[PDB]
Write a protein that binds this ligand. Structure first.
Ligand SMILES: O=c1ccn([C@@H]2O[C@H](COP(=O)(O)OP(=O)(O)O)[C@@H](O)[C@H]2O)c(=O)[nH]1
Ligand SMILES: O=c1ccn([C@@H]2O[C@H](COP(=O)(O)OP(=O)(O)O)[C@@H](O)[C@H]2O)c(=O)[nH]1
Ligand SMILES: O=C(O)[C@@H](COP(=O)(O)O)O[C@H]1O[C@H](CO)[C@@H](O)[C@H](O)[C@H]1O
Ligand SMILES: O=C(O)[C@@H](COP(=O)(O)O)O[C@H]1O[C@H](CO)[C@@H](O)[C@H](O)[C@H]1O
Ligand SMILES: [Mn+2]
Ligand SMILES: [Mn+2]
Lengths: 279, 279
């Protein structure tokens, strides 16, 4: 039911670029304190700039390490959350960074790549844009790869329960994906870590499976977070997914008991609206 | 909001036994292929038999290893699913084993202990029965301990979303707990791995928090399953939890893509009814 490219696409950078046909391509790297990895990621993509890729920015989501200076030193344009859209006060979380990035880019096609990847392949961007460039009706491309605890324990089983039509999607939460600006500026953006699952469900509801493709990127490595930070992420994924399914979420943050101690993590039920309204 | 015993209970086996006041206590160990651990678990509890504990059975849920012979050799009464309730054909899964165990025991109080625990403390059963024996209105006692991936990523965040009143429960899926027969024979039993979360939500809805206590067992160790088996368990926990919250579940099993291969795991939306109807 779902256009899946199972092996390495056969296209080439010169073919894909020809297929642009006046369309532009922006790449956004969201980054929060990724000084150890930001440079390797930027370098994997910057050789494409002024060719297949027209624009690369790092959206610096409030880093307090050396993320920004190392990104500048790799030749990337770095855009803070405030600069992307300064009339609107900044909220925390990943979804805010990606939503704002629409105002700081102008490509007809937008590619998101996480900045915490350990040594990413230089064809990620070409592999993701393939179906948007050479297909018909594809508006969103998700990646899969490779062990993804939230994906396999939370998102895929809840999708099977509540949107089983998306059961064929191998990595619904994947941070590497591309989509048309027309789609992205028409969809709301869930806060925090809810943004990927929200975009997938909203895209499906509006365009169906035929507008979605997925592409094998082989294997990917990244910062494996401790279980407690995953708990808050799972809570936000659940909150965003239930809302899309018409189920009322309590809005109560996850509490954890670490001779134990207690901490309550934030959860948000507030989406950003389609960036179109900002026109 | 929730009666919590945070340090080691101060009671003694002789005090607790005196407090029985004619009430009986059954212990059930569900077991599916636990030959490596069944013996250490039985031995931790059998010294209590004919004193605090009136009855110990192993409910052999279809083992094909040496579980049954090793349990017999530790002096335990072993009851198959068929023998517990032979007029009713056997279904797979943990919940079926626990539900049937009500027909093969007669204690006024029933204690469940998983049979895959690595070296369990001999006071587990005394610590769990404490609040049922010495409290008032306690009808269910859950344990906590100790890293519990389904609990921290699936069950606690979904409870926070959908039954936030149970947010103070530290280990909702814990396999070690005790309850009155009157409660257990009044509640349905969810299939598979849904049984613990189902019993907790059903108990709360019927009796509120004041009927539930929890007790610190310190640290517990057990067979840490691979992520893919956890995926099917999470799917069933989600299915049981959504049903209790009035949310329709698709009934679609989780599919996993392991040059990948596909497998679909069973999920069940069929509860067993209150054992009372079998009277
Ligand atoms: O408020 C935030 C949180 C995260 N990120 C970025 O979003 C990406 C994915 O975040 P994370 O690693 O925490 O998620 P994971 O992939 O580990 O589940 C990373 O490049 C982060 O730098 C961000 O820009 N802003
Ligand atoms: O169909 C089944 C599945 C499991 N069990 C028992 O239920 C307990 C808990 O099962 P499991 O270890 O798979 O769950 P976990 O604690 O690892 O999440 C164990 O003693 C199993 O032997 C059972 O009696 N029947
Ligand atoms: O899927 C997951 O379990 C997590 C983290 O992966 P691990 O459990 O650390 O292997 O990462 C997912 O979610 C993130 C936030 O939504 C995305 O940025 C990742 O790309 C996605 O894989
Ligand atoms: O909470 C969990 O993640 C799992 C398995 O624990 P691990 O992730 O292997 O540490 O076990 C829970 O669920 C089982 C089935 O419902 C219960 O039998 C366990 O007692 C409970 O801890
Ligand atoms: Mn990451
Ligand atoms: Mn276990």
């Amino acid at each position: 039911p779902l256009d899946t490219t199972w092996h390495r696409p056969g296209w080439t950078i010169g073919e894909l670029e020809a297929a642009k046909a006046g369309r532009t391509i922006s790449v956004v790297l969201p980054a929060l304190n990724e000084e150890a990895t930001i440079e390797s990621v930027i370098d994997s993509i910057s050789p494409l700039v002024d060719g297949l890729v027209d624009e690369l920015i790092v959206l610096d989501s409030g880093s307090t390490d050396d993320t920004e200076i190392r990104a500048i030193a790799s030749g990337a344009r770095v855009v803070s959350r405030e600069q992307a859209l300064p009339e609107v006060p900044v909220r925390p979380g990943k979804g805010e960074a990606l939503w704002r990035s629409l105002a700081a880019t102008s490509g007809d096609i937008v590619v998101f790549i996480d900045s915490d990847l350990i040594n990413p392949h230089p064809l990620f961007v070409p592999w993701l844009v393939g179906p948007l460039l050479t297909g018909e009706g594809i508006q969103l491309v998700k990646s899969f790869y490779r062990g993804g605890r939230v994906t396999e324990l939370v998102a895929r089983p809840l999708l099977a329960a509540l949107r089983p039509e998306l059961g064929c999607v191998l990595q619904p939460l994947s941070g590497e994906y591309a989509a048309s600006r027309e789609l992205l500026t028409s969809l709301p953006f869930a806060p925090g870590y809810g943004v990927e699952i929200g975009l997938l469900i909203d895209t499906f509801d509006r365009l169906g499976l035929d507008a979605i493709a997925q592409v094998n990127l082989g294997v990917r490595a990244h910062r494996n977070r401790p279980l407690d930070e995953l708990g808050a992420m799972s809570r936000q994924v659940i909150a965003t997914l239930l809302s899309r399914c018409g189920i009322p979420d309590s809005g109560v943050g996850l509490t954890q008991f670490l001779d134990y101690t207690r901490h309550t993590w934030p959860v948000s039920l507030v989406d950003r609206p389609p960036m179109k309204v900002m026109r």
